[PDB]
Structures are given as C-alpha cells and as structure tokens.
C-alpha cells in the first residue's frame, strides 16, 4: 500500500464521517443517525408509522456501532481509525465487513420491497448531504445502478461497498457512494 493509496483511502473515510455528521458538531453520535432518519422521513414524505420504523432502524444501527447515549467520536478520530482498521483486514474479515454494511442497505429501503429505489437513494444522499443537488443525486444513483434497470439491488450495493471500504485508487463508484469526495 503506497502513501498515495493511504491518502486516497483516508479521503474516502473523511467523506463518510463528514456526511454521517449531519448535526455538524464535528462528532459522530446517535443524534446523527436519528437526524438522518428524520430527514429521510421528511424528504420521502413517509407516513408517521413508516417514519418511526425508519427512526428505530437507524438507532438500532447506532446501537450496533456502540453509539450509546452520550457517546461521541470526533470525525477526525473516526476517519483515522477507519482507514487503519480497514487497511489491516485480510480476506475473511473484509468479507464480513461487507456483509455487515448491508444493514445500511436495509435502512435506506424504507418500503421494504428488498430493493433501493431512486426516491429511497435520493432521500438518503440528500439527508447526509443537504448540499447535493437533485441532478447529482440522480448521477450517484445511476452509478450504483450497474444494469440500469432503475433500482439498486443488494448485489450492486455490495460490490460498491466493497470498493468504498477497500479500494485504493479513484473510482466513480466511491464518488457516488456518499457521494463526492
């Protein structure tokens, strides 16, 4: 792994943590996960029943990540610890990290039809990136939609996640993920 490779990977990890920090305090906490769910519910005009299910799902992810009440990790620490951890992983641990990431797929799938639609992916991207234009969100969606069938399936999401977490050189995939480093 080169110095340029490591720096690229850190840029990706910084993008991830800055996008997740929707509260804008320079930390990652369960408040961030809750706000992303709340914003998705507004953007996607979810019913009150679906909005609460989605809020609970995001908080469950916060719980799985260890973001208990009062726990806050700086975006700087989060990003550094991510590049360090992920770049040390061998094959079996990589595979598990990728499967684990699919919990985020399920969160974004708010109608639970097992696919991520354009509305669902757009709601997610604009929840974490309020500055991202409708056009750019569509571009990001089209990047993940490998077969151009109008939905992001779990296979498409998974191969994208793998490149985002472990990729060492620039791709359109990694840019669409959050998207825009």
- Which residues make up each annotated binding site? 109, 111, 113, 115, 120, 145, 147, 149, 151, 156
The only residue of 21, 82, 124, 177 in contact with Ca ion, by rule CB under 5 A: 21
The only residue of 36, 58, 109, 123 in contact with Ca ion, by rule CB under 5 A: 109
Q: Which is nearer to Ca ion, 8 or 126 (CB)?
A: 126
Alpha-carbon dihedral sign for residues 103, 109, 114, 116: negative
The only residue of 25, 63, 76, 169 in contact with Ca ion, by rule CB under 5 A: 25
Q: From the CB of 91, what's the least distance to Ca ion, in Å?
A: 26
DSSP-derived 3-state class of residue 27: strand
Phi, psi of 101 (to 5 degrees): -60, -20
43-49 long-range contacts, CB within 8 A, separation 24+: 43/122, 43/123, 43/126, 43/127, 44/110, 44/119, 44/120, 44/123, 46/110
Beta partners for 116? Answer: 152
Binding map of Ca ion across residues 28-47, x = CB under 5 A, - = no contact: ----x---------------
Nearest residue to the partner Ca ion, using Cβ = 23
Both tokens of 47, joined, read 């019913």
Per CB under 5 A, residues contacting Ca ion are: 21, 23, 25, 27, 32, 109, 111, 113, 115, 117, 145, 147, 149
């Amino acid at each position: 792994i080169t110095e340029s490779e490591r720096a690229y990977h850190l840029r990706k990890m910084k993008t991830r943590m800055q996008r997740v920090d929707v509260t804008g305090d320079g930390f990652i906490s369960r408040e961030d996960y809750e706000l992303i769910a709340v914003r998705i519910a507004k953007i996607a005009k979810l019913s009150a029943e679906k909005a609460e299910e989605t809020r609970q799902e995001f908080l469950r992810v916060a719980d799985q990540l260890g973001l208990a009440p009062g726990v806050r990790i700086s975006v700087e620490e989060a990003a550094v610890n991510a590049t360090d951890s992920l770049l040390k992983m061998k094959g079996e641990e990589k595979a598990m990290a990728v499967i684990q990431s699919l919990i985020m797929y399920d969160c974004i799938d708010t109608d639970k039809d097992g696919y991520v639609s354009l509305p669902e992916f757009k709601a997610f991207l604009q929840a974490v990136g309020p500055d991202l234009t409708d056009d750019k969100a569509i571009t990001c969606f089209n990047t993940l939609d490998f077969n151009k069938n109008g939905q992001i399936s779990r296979d498409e999401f998974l191969v994208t996640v793998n490149d985002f977490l472990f990729g060492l050189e620039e791709t359109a995939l990694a840019n669409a993920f959050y998207g825009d480093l």
